[PDB]
């Protein structure tokens, strides 16, 4: 806190509580007693614990019938309207699309549909699998995940 170290008043004789700095945290405009600092909140997770957790989540998505598997998922042009119709025909919403290779047309089309995300099979994560109501995987994506999780 900005301010000099000058003692506000003599130690004795004034009839007033003893003070040593205007910057004391007891005072108005004083410092914060345990002032925060920038800090890193990340945690370690063991590789086997991370991969072990993914296997559990994937097994529930099957057991809950939330995992859908398809042969192909692609769109002829980046037009968002095309993807919206395709998902409506499948009665899909709040869906995570996982593909074994990224069709740039599919990526662009999904970008404005906030209820939709498009992910390459390398980019899956614990939270997205749990947050979305349905997960759609191409048969290629499944095999890449099997090889990834082994």
Segment 104 to 123, residues that bind Mg ion, using CB under 5 A: 110, 113
Q: For residue 131, give the DSSP letter.
A: H
Segment 23 to 62, residues that bind RNA, using CB under 7 A: 23, 25-40, 42, 44-52
Residue 2 is a binding residue for Mg ion (CB under 5 A): yes
Chain mean position to CA 117: 13
Rounded-to-10 torsion of CA 136, 139, 143, 149: 10
Q: How far apart are CA 97 and CA 135, in angstroms?
A: 6
* 147, containing H or E segment: helix 139-149
Residue 147 is a binding residue for RNA (CB under 7 A): no
Please choose which of RNA, Mg ion, none residue 4 contacts, taking the beta carbon within 5 to 8 angstroms, the exact cut-off set by kind: RNA
Helix, strand and coil percent figures for the chain, each rounded to 5: 35, 15, 55
Residue among 11, 15, 89, 127 that touches Mg ion (CB under 5 A): 15
Q: Which residue has the tokens 């007693």?
A: 33
Residue 86 is a binding residue for RNA (CB under 7 A): no
Residue among 57, 61, 92, 108 that touches RNA (CB under 7 A): 108
Footprint on this chain of RNA (rule: CB under 7 A): 1-6, 12-23, 25-40, 42, 44-52, 78-81, 84, 108-109, 111-115, 122-123, 125, 131, 148
């Amino acid at each position: 806190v900005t301010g000099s170290g000058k003692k506000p008043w003599r130690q004795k004789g004034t009839g007033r509580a003893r003070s040593g700095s205007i910057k004391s945290p007891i005072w108005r405009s004083g410092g914060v007693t345990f002032a925060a600092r920038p800090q890193d909140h990340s945690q370690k997770v063991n590789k086997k614990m991370y991969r072990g957790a993914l296997k559990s989540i994937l097994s529930e998505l099957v057991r809950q019938d939330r995992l859908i598997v398809v042969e192909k998922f692609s769109v002829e042009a980046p037009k968002t309207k095309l993807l919206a119709q395709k998902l409506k025909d499948m009665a899909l919403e709040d869906v995570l699309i996982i593909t074994g290779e990224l069709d740039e047309n599919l990526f662009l089309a999904a970008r404005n549909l906030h209820k939709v995300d498009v992910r390459d099979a390398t980019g899956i994560d614990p939270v997205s699998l749990i947050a979305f109501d349905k997960v759609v995987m191409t048969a290629d994506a499944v095999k890449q995940v099997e090889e990834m999780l082994a």
